[PDB]
Enzyme design. Structure first.
Site, mmCIF file in Angstrom:
data_model
loop_
_atom_site.group_PDB
_atom_site.id
_atom_site.type_symbol
_atom_site.label_atom_id
_atom_site.label_comp_id
_atom_site.label_asym_id
_atom_site.label_seq_id
_atom_site.Cartn_x
_atom_site.Cartn_y
_atom_site.Cartn_z
ATOM 1 N N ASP A 126 44.938 9.374 -41.683
ATOM 2 C CA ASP A 126 45.761 9.909 -40.593
ATOM 3 C C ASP A 126 45.162 11.198 -40.071
ATOM 4 O OD1 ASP A 126 48.175 9.348 -39.151
ATOM 5 O OD2 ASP A 126 48.804 11.189 -40.125
ATOM 6 N N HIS A 133 51.106 18.804 -30.733
ATOM 7 C CA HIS A 133 51.815 18.550 -31.994
ATOM 8 C C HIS A 133 51.412 19.594 -33.027
ATOM 9 C CE1 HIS A 133 53.646 16.669 -35.443
ATOM 10 N NE2 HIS A 133 52.479 16.724 -36.062
ATOM 11 N N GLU A 199 57.221 9.670 -36.874
ATOM 12 C CA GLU A 199 56.096 10.264 -36.156
ATOM 13 C C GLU A 199 55.444 9.205 -35.273
ATOM 14 O OE1 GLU A 199 53.792 12.293 -38.999
ATOM 15 O OE2 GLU A 199 54.610 14.214 -38.726
ATOM 16 N N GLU A 201 52.677 7.573 -33.344
ATOM 17 C CA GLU A 201 51.225 7.585 -33.388
ATOM 18 C C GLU A 201 50.656 6.284 -32.824
ATOM 19 O OE1 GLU A 201 49.432 8.877 -37.148
ATOM 20 O OE2 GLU A 201 51.373 9.786 -37.537
ATOM 21 N N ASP A 233 54.626 6.898 -38.526
ATOM 22 C CA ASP A 233 54.395 7.471 -39.848
ATOM 23 C C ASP A 233 55.656 8.170 -40.355
ATOM 24 O OD1 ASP A 233 53.277 8.390 -42.259
ATOM 25 O OD2 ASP A 233 52.277 9.978 -41.431
ATOM 26 N N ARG A 237 60.491 15.331 -44.705
ATOM 27 C CA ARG A 237 59.885 16.644 -44.469
ATOM 28 C C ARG A 237 60.190 17.654 -45.567
ATOM 29 N NH1 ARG A 237 56.586 16.186 -40.383
ATOM 30 N NH2 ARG A 237 57.252 14.853 -38.611
ATOM 31 N N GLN A 240 57.887 16.683 -48.345
ATOM 32 C CA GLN A 240 56.559 17.145 -47.946
ATOM 33 C C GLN A 240 56.379 18.646 -48.108
ATOM 34 O OE1 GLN A 240 55.526 15.945 -43.972
ATOM 35 N NE2 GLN A 240 53.430 16.694 -44.104
ATOM 36 N N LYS A 253 54.908 11.175 -47.179
ATOM 37 C CA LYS A 253 54.404 10.202 -46.237
ATOM 38 C C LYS A 253 54.380 8.791 -46.795
ATOM 39 C CE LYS A 253 53.471 13.236 -43.116
ATOM 40 N NZ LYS A 253 53.803 13.140 -41.667
ATOM 41 N N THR A 257 54.990 3.436 -43.800
ATOM 42 C CA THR A 257 54.320 3.706 -42.522
ATOM 43 C C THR A 257 54.326 2.380 -41.762
ATOM 44 O OG1 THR A 257 52.934 5.403 -43.521
ATOM 45 C CG2 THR A 257 52.115 4.401 -41.498
ATOM 46 N N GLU A 364 59.990 18.150 -33.922
ATOM 47 C CA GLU A 364 59.722 18.841 -32.669
ATOM 48 C C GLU A 364 60.856 18.715 -31.666
ATOM 49 O OE1 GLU A 364 55.268 18.183 -31.555
ATOM 50 O OE2 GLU A 364 55.984 16.623 -32.945
HETATM 51 C C1 LIG Z 1 50.849 16.489 -40.902
HETATM 52 AS AS1 LIG Z 1 52.700 16.567 -40.170
HETATM 53 C C2 LIG Z 1 52.894 18.496 -39.822
HETATM 54 O O1 LIG Z 1 52.490 15.723 -38.568
HETATM 55 O O2 LIG Z 1 53.934 15.948 -41.293
HETATM 56 CA CA LIG Z 2 51.330 11.553 -39.464
#
Ligand SMILES: C[As](C)(=O)[O-]
Ligand SMILES: [Ca+2]
Ligand SMILES: C[As](C)(=O)[O-]
Ligand SMILES: [Ca+2]
Lengths: 416, 416
Positions: A126, A133, A199, A201, A233, A237, A240, A253, A257, A364
């Site tokens: 990744d 971002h 996420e 992507e 993904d 958090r 993480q 993560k 995914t 975000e």
């Molecule tokens: C690597 As991230 C800050 O997109 O969980």
């Molecule tokens: Ca990611």
């Protein structure tokens, strides 16, 4: 166009022709198909129609349960396959069109098929190549003066991901348990993730590998890029945040995914190529190449809570918001001699444009849970709730046709 | 004892019986063998002698080119296979011993055999579980008061590694090119790694997986651990330092990771179990279990420059130093629902004890290039030179026998 009818707003006109792995009730063996209109063309059934020089002694690749061997054949084979399919699917060509018994065996409905992962993914990587971002995360966790770390504008930062938990669109995702540290003056605790996120992507599949110890020069990088899929993904958090210094994202993560099943070949996307973002400072020579390789791919993300009657669109973005290109990612990934292999999956990292409506995570969109996301019907979100379903879609828009990616969907199950 | 004569210092008495994949000049098919004395017993040849309840319908696993399917069968199968092999190889049993025809086809000299990777590794993970290693790195890079980061004593920190570049013992490793930032006033440069290092580790292979979304409770973790190998995680330290914040080690690791080929089953190692290191603070309940699962395995690392006639031992250590056990690593790896799969490889992290002679990297042995490592014959090292060969060995020491691992070797080739 095709003898197969294709609606105007179909993701799968003759200009697309993505590759996927599917099965049916009557035949549960995973096999290779190509999407056209609302049908699947079964390549295991029509493998003997690939009579050109690059494929005539390799027709067995279309009989496999995964796309790996076809990916490994390289660009001449992919181009010949596409030309053969375009000629066979054309409305004015008779072979497949007029062979009734073959045609009845070769085409089935998408609506009755089960999709599988398109390849056996030996390694998943990744990257982190969307500048807005990385900037947004930097602002949220380090402040505006330290928005990007020092290496970000010099190389396409990335990490090794977990391959086993890459799952096909529609697979339910269970909220993970783990340890977190909500209070820094107390020991960590064990419990359900409280900050579960998506996420947005995209990712590309590798074609022919490079030999162990032999870098891929940037001028040849485009030879090794087979095609693309959408990706979510999923991210825990709070898990993480406690785990990831200094060795990187791990259990935050690796619980899941999701990717879409239809792999859109790079040849289908080349008409939508746009200039690469200007890079300053200019990259070192090994990452410097003039080939345009940035793509205008519209992306959208919806969220629907259990109970809610309709999904809300929470993100509208575009794959053109990537500062480091796929050529640069592939080159950087092999510059040390690392051996990329057919079916490897290299993902973009979360895609965010500069417009706040295009931010690709709820981290975000909610700005670290300080803003409520309006998801319609009097409901709001910061992070995901149990029962929430997230669907990613994307397409390139041509004149009277789209090159679409289908969907990348998952629904959150309660922790267990 | 076996009817196969075994030297007292052999790594492979009847008390060991490790599993590997080999081929010969006579037969290019990679196939499964068990080491005994200086011989290999070919399990495909004698697979019909596994007549017990766990293996009778699973004899085809011994005809495969990798150990994955056998690993996936689980403990009852492994125990049955081991019992059958101990009987068949016994000095007092006639079945194989007196079958000259079968013996002829079933045995091969190790000197004639080419070893291959023992399994298809779907995912490789590298933990960081030696306390002195993490402490040493902390001191060197952050200062003596900040030896450990805040999470280290609370979870077994680890990262996803690169599977493709795990190579079998004997594979030459090319010094990697990449990006580095030798000092902070100038832009990064492109060039050959200047700080090339080894890392002494051991790793275990996963047996039966867990279902996606379903954790492995720590009381069942021992059911999923098949056996162990030696590992050298070659490291490009200047490449790693520039790249690794914030997403972790990447190209600094992925140019090559070497493992030994003979997988020593956990049952062979259980006689050498010792108490787990005491943990303070006490870990959360999901990581808490009273079963001893720390192993007294002597480890040694030698270095030989290209002009030397004698290799120098530069590290003498032991797997028993590790603070987090394999049970804790496997439990933590699946606590979020991540699905471990047969043939996955979970490595320990660099093994360092508290004695400076037991530090597991040249980074530590040279203390960040500040001390010369004596490699004998008038020569010193800080980091690896082109042409250096590093060999890791290990064994458990019994009364009149050892359970050994064979070699984990590689020679450095010059950069491109
Ligand atoms: C690597 As991230 C800050 O997109 O969980
Ligand atoms: Ca990611
Ligand atoms: C993760 As290390 C400091 O053993 O290269
Ligand atoms: Ca390591």
């Amino acid at each position: 166009m095709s003898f197969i009818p294709v609606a105007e707003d179909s993701d799968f006109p003759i200009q697309n022709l993505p590759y996927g792995v599917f099965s049916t009730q009557s035949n549960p063996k995973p096999r290779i198909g190509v999407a056209i209109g609302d049908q699947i063309l079964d390549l295991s059934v029509i493998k003997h129609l690939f009579t050109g020089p690059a494929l005539s002694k390799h027709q067995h690749v279309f009989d496999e349960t995964t796309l790996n061997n076809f990916m490994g054949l390289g660009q001449a084979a992919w181009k010949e396959a596409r030309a053969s399919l375009q000629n066979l699917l054309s409305a004015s060509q008779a072979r497949l069109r007029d062979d009734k018994e073959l045609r009845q065996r070769a085409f089935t409905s998408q609506a009755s098929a089960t999709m599988h992962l398109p390849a056996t993914i030996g390694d998943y990587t990744d990257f982190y190549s969307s500048r807005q971002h990385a900037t947004n995360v930097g602002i949220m966790f380090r402040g505006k003066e330290n928005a990007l770390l020092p290496n970000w504008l010099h190389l396409p930062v990335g990490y090794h991901g977990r391959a086993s938990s890459i799952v096909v669109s529609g697979t339910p995702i269970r909220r993970p348990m783990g340890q977190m540290r909500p209070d820094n003056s107390k020991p960590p605790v064990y419990g359900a993730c409280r900050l579960l996120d998506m996420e947005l992507e995209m990712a590309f599949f590798v074609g022919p590998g490079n030999r162990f110890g032999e870098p891929i020069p940037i001028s040849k990088a485009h030879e090794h890029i087979f095609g693309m899929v959408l990706m979510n993904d999923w991210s825990a958090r709070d898990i993480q945040q406690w785990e990831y210094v200094p060795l990187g994202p791990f259990l935050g993560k690796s619980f899941g995914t999701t990717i879409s099943p239809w792999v859109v070949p790079m040849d289908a996307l080349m008409p939508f190529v746009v200039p690469n973002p200007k890079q300053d400072p200019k990259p070192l020579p090994y990452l410097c190449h003039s080939q345009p390789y940035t793509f205008d791919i519209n992306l959208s993300v919806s969220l629907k809570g259990e109970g809610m009657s309709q999904a809300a669109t929470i993100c509208r973005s575009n794959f053109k918001h990537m500062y480091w290109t796929m050529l640069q990612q592939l080159t950087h990934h092999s510059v040390n001699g690392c051996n990329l292999r057919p079916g490897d999956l290299l993902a973009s990292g979360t895609i965010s444009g500069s417009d706040p409506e295009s931010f690709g995570s709820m981290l975000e969109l909610s700005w670290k849970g300080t803003k409520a996301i309006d998801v319609g019907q009097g409901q709001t979100r910061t992070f995901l709730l149990d029962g929430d379903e997230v669907i990613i879609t994307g397409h390139c828009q041509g004149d009277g046709y789209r090159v679409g990616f289908g969907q990348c969907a998952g629904k959150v199950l309660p922790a267990l």
